[PDB]
Paper text:
The gamma-tubulin ring complex (γ-TuRC) is the principal microtubule nucleation template in vertebrates. Microtubules are formed de novo in a process termed nucleation, which is spatially and temporally highly controlled by γ-tubulin complexes, composed of γ-tubulin1 and associated γ-tubulin-complex proteins (GCP). In most eukaryotes, microtubules are templated from a preassembled γ-tubulin ring complex (γ-TuRC) that determines the position and direction of microtubule growth. Here, we used cryo-EM to identify and characterize γ-TuRC assembly intermediates after recombinant expression of the complex, which allowed us to delineate a comprehensive stepwise assembly pathway from a stable 6-spoked core to the mature 14-spoked γ-TuRC, identifying successive stabilization and conformational locking of γ-TuSC units as central principles in the assembly process.
To test this possibility, we specifically omitted GCP2 and GCP3 from the expression system, reconstituting γ-TuRC∆GCP2/3.
Author numbering:
A (entry chain Y): 3 to 41, 45 to 93, 101 to 177, 180 to 279, 287 to 306, 313 to 447
B (entry chain K): 253 to 291, 300 to 422, 448 to 502, 509 to 631, 636 to 657
Write the structure that this text describes.
């Protein structure tokens, strides 16, 4: 149903601001909120129907030692939102300890925004793992959402720190936050710095300003994933029914996210499905195969081509899956948005669970272990000491992700009556 | 009137062909439903002159008579098509019927299912038909058509005394002088398919509420194999199949009624449209219809197991779970034999559970 973006982390606040200006350009709205004269469709998934048809976006801004709010303040997006929703470190443990003492008023902010909405179903998070301020505070917020709301959803659109081995404290923080995301979040959409950066270097001619184009890529991905919710289709437009088909394995909830236009500047659905199953078009980094696949096609589509494309895709064995059930590739259709300022309105998306992400997780399972053996990169921060005296929480996270690896490899088998 | 009395062969000369008589039926019944409500009337004298000319011929031949009747019928169908599409909004009436009987707006009915299950039990003859109509119209009055919809009178199987969620009636009174395309039998058949589509929407909605297993919740005979996951993916895929068959027939209907200018062709397209919807949504008796009935029963019994357990706990639920896995395998090969008629919606899938044959060999 209706979901409220909780932005946290520096890149998380960047993709939150980019997402709101993307939705301001997408919908027929002013930068005050007033309805335009070119804008019935639904505008109630992220926007409250406020005073003068002011579609005020429902959002939560969280950070520590504020940086980006100045860029919000001198912009016309301090006149679109903020009726009072903006709240003002460098390690997971420092962020955890800082979020421990101010858990009351941030939980009051969550309660205020839950009372502000009209139908609460899930809390979507626009977050960056090891963004600085996001690490630790984000995991503690995930623990608070799991403890206080077991009946609602926790969605995490997130990028994960991979530099292909830069920063020597981020594998500890990412593994601990990944354990918190397994136990305290309901669905994770995984993205990577190397995958988005490599595709950005491919489709463009940049290498240094990676952040500003990663904001555009993540905003387009998030708008494509919520296109069928914001603009009315008639399939599974609640978040619960949409993610219900998307997760085949109840512990393996990390989803591949491809996008057939890497740059948005003719084609059939067969060709973009053949494109979309290739990992080079996917922004996500032995026997690896999917468990269940679903794809969403929006544009100037002929539905009988969706028929023949599904027929040929599953029969030519490019949907690669050996499940313990019948779980399969799924087609889905969406209506492309009226009054996009973007041209070339044919666009495709895939949301599938693949075991190949386990190999990328194994790199993190290497890195922490490697940095535990050299012992000059745990850095002996005192906040890590007061977090846990035995430092066995990192071993617990390693155990949880090792169970995750064994569950991926058991889901490759036709039996899931045994995992390691 | 349309309380008309039909033209049959105890009373027709048997040398006159029948098809001319149903065309004359069409012409006269439109004259019946404009004689009343005055508190095709521009060319009636031409029709009377042609009938007088037909009277004047002493040796009648049938082929000239058929040509004269066709000449009358073309202008009759043109006038009726122009009047009924423009002034009484035939496309709007088809949209209303699609939204309420064929569930083209399934959002309001999904919220109505969210507010009521107690007519999984049975009605006694006083009371609950009022309750379904009041609750449905109020839940429609929250948002999305507040201005209207206080006009469908919700009846389930409330003739009273039987379940009803596979048996919800619907009576919506059409404009009889302005729309003779809709008959009581046509609305009756729409009512049956409305019952059928209600049942599948109920079972999928309950199973995604248990997908809150995932908002909330030991291996090997606790986690009901999470067969919540094994069951919901395949039921949701069949739900998408009923989705794309309903849109394919409705879009073909709107293009077909826009293309032609004779109201008889509108009626042929309309009857073909409803017959295809009945054949393709598995209302017709086939082993595919047998498969969908069993998959409804399996989903209902499965939701009854998984609702009351909250988290993973063995409540002697494995005894139910064995029946669930065995029926799961039996309807597994049966959705294989669903799975492609020669119709693109029902054809859309015999690759979709046939690939790695976990349901062909299991």
């Amino acid at each position: 149903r209706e979901i409220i973006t909780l932005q946290l982390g520096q890149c998380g606040n960047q993709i939150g601001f980019e997402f709101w200006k993307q939705l301001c350009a997408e919908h027929g709205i002013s930068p005050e909120g007033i309805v335009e004269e070119f804008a019935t469709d639904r505008k109630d998934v992220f926007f409250y129907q406020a005073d003068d048809e002011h579609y005020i976006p429902r959002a939560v801004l969280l950070d520590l030692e504020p940086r980006v709010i100045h860029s919000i303040l001198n912009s016309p997006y301090a006149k679109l939102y903020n009726p009072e929703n903006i709240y003002l470190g460098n390690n997971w443990a420092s962020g955890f300890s800082q979020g421990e003492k101010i858990h009351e008023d941030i939980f009051d902010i969550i309660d205020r925004e839950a009372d502000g909405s009209d139908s609460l179903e899930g809390f979507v998070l626009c977050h960056s793992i090891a963004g600085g301020t996001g690490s630790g505070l984000g995991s503690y917020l995930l623990e608070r959402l799991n403890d206080r709301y077991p009946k609602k959803l926790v969605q995490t659109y997130s990028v994960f720190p991979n530099q292909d081995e830069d920063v020597v404290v981020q594998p500890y923080n990412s593994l601990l936050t990944l354990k918190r995301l397994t136990q305290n979040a309901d669905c994770v959409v995984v993205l990577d710095n190397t995958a988005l950066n490599r595709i950005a270097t491919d489709r463009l001619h940049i290498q240094n300003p990676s952040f500003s184009q990663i904001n555009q890529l993540v905003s387009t991905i998030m708008s494509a994933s919520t296109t069928t919710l914001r603009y009315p289709g008639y399939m599974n437009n609640d978040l619960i029914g949409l993610i219900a088909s998307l997760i085949p394995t109840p512990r393996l909830h990390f989803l591949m996210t491809g996008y057939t236009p890497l740059t948005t500047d003719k084609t059939t659905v067969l060709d973009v499905m053949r494109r979309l199953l290739q990992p080079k078009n996917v922004m996500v980094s032995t026997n690896h195969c999917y468990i269940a696949i679903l794809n969403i096609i929006q544009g100037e589509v002929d539905p009988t081509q969706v028929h023949k494309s599904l027929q040929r895709i599953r029969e030519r064995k490019l949907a690669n899956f050996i499940p313990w059930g019948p779980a399969s590739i799924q087609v889905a259709l969406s209506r492309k948005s009226p009054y996009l300022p973007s041209a070339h309105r044919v666009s495709g998306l895939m949301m599938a669970n693949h075991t190949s992400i386990s190999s990328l997780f194994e790199r993190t399972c290497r890195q922490y272990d490697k940095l535990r053996k050299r012992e000059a990169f745990l850095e002996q921060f005192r906040k890590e000491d007061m977090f846990k005296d035995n430092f066995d929480e990192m071993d617990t996270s390693r155990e949880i992700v090792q169970q995750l690896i064994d569950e991926y490899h058991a889901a490759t088998r036709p039996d899931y009556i045994s995992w390691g | 009137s349309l309380k008309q009395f039909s033209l049959r062969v105890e009373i027709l000369p048997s040398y006159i062909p029948v098809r001319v008589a149903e065309k004359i039926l069409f012409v006269g019944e439109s004259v019946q439903m404009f004689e009343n409500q005055n508190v095709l009337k521009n060319q009636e004298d031409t029709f009377a002159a042609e009938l007088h000319r037909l009277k004047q011929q002493p040796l009648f031949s049938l082929v000239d008579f058929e040509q004269v009747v066709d000449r009358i019928r073309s202008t009759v169908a043109e006038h009726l098509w122009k009047l009924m599409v423009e002034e009484s909004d035939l496309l709007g009436q088809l949209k209303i019927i699609k939204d309420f009987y064929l569930l083209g707006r399934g959002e309001l009915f999904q919220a109505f299912i969210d507010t009521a299950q107690h007519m999984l039990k049975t009605p006694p003859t006083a009371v609950t038909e009022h309750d379904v109509n009041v609750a449905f119209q109020q839940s429609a009055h929250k948002v999305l058509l507040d201005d209207d919809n206080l006009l469908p009178l919700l009846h389930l199987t409330i003739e009273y005394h039987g379940s009803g969620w596979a048996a919800l009636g619907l009576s919506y009174k059409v404009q009889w002088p302005l729309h003779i395309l809709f008959t009581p039998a046509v609305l009756e058949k729409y009512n049956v398919v409305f019952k059928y589509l209600l049942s599948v929407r109920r079972v999928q909605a309950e199973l995604q509420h248990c997908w809150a297993l995932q908002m909330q919740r030991q291996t090997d005979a606790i986690k009901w194999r999470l067969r919540n996951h094994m069951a919901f993916l395949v039921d949701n895929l069949q739900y998408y199949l009923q989705v794309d068959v309903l849109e394919s027939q409705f879009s073909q209907l709107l293009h077909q009624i826009n293309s032609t200018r004779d109201f008889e062709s509108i009626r042929l397209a309309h009857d073909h449209f409803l017959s295809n919807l009945l054949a393709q949504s598995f209302i017709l008796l086939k082993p595919v219809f047998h498969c969908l009935n069993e998959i409804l029963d399996l989903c209902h019994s499965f939701c009854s197991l998984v609702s009351q357990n909250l988290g993973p706990l063995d409540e002697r639920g494995a005894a139910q779970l064995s029946i669930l896995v065995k029926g799961f395998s039996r309807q597994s090969s049966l959705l294989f034999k669903i799975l492609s008629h020669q119709i693109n919606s029902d054809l859309a899938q015999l690759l979709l559970r046939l690939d790695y044959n976990k349901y062909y060999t299991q």
